[PDB]
Amino acid sequence: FQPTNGVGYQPYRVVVLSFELLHAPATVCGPKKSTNLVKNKCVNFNFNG
Amino acid sequence: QCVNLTTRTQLPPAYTNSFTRGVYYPDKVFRSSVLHS
Ligand SMILES: *[C@@H]1O[C@H](CO)[C@@H](O[C@@H]2O[C@H](CO)[C@@H](O)[C@H](O)[C@H]2NC(C)=O)[C@H](O)[C@H]1NC(C)=O
Numbered sequence: 001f002q003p004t005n006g007v008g009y010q011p012y013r014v015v016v017l018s019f020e021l022l023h024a025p026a027t028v029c030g031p032k033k034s035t036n037l038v039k040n041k042c043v044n045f046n047f048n049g
Numbered sequence: 050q051c052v053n054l055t056t057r058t059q060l061p062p063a064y065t066n067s068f069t070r071g072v073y074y075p076d077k078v079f080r081s082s083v084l085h086s
Contacts, residue, residue: 023076023077
């Protein structure tokens with residue numbers, strides 16, 4: 001790792017994000033507002049994705 | 050800290066017939082009456 005080196009030798013910080021779905025009650029969720037839950041209505045539900 | 054316990058009788062390991070036990074839930078999915086393989 002030297003600054004005098006050209007393209008192809010510079011250090012690159014790599015972060016790999018991994019996750020499993022549909023196997024356990026999730027806790028991490030994206031930013032989305034929660035609306036009121038109606039009971040007897042044909043609606044488009046979205047529970048944890 | 051370690052203490053080597055002595056004065057222990059040496060016996061051969063015994064065995065028994067494990068009956069129909071050890072069944073666990075493979076997943077957290079609720080199932081009412083489906084015979085899931
Ligand atoms: C309990 O027994 C073990 C087994 O011999 C002892 O571990 C030995 O310790 C000596 C001294 O440090 C080593 O030279 C041997 O190589 C060890 N043997 C093994 C198999 O690891 C242990 O010291 C004993 N503990 C007490 C409190 O007497």
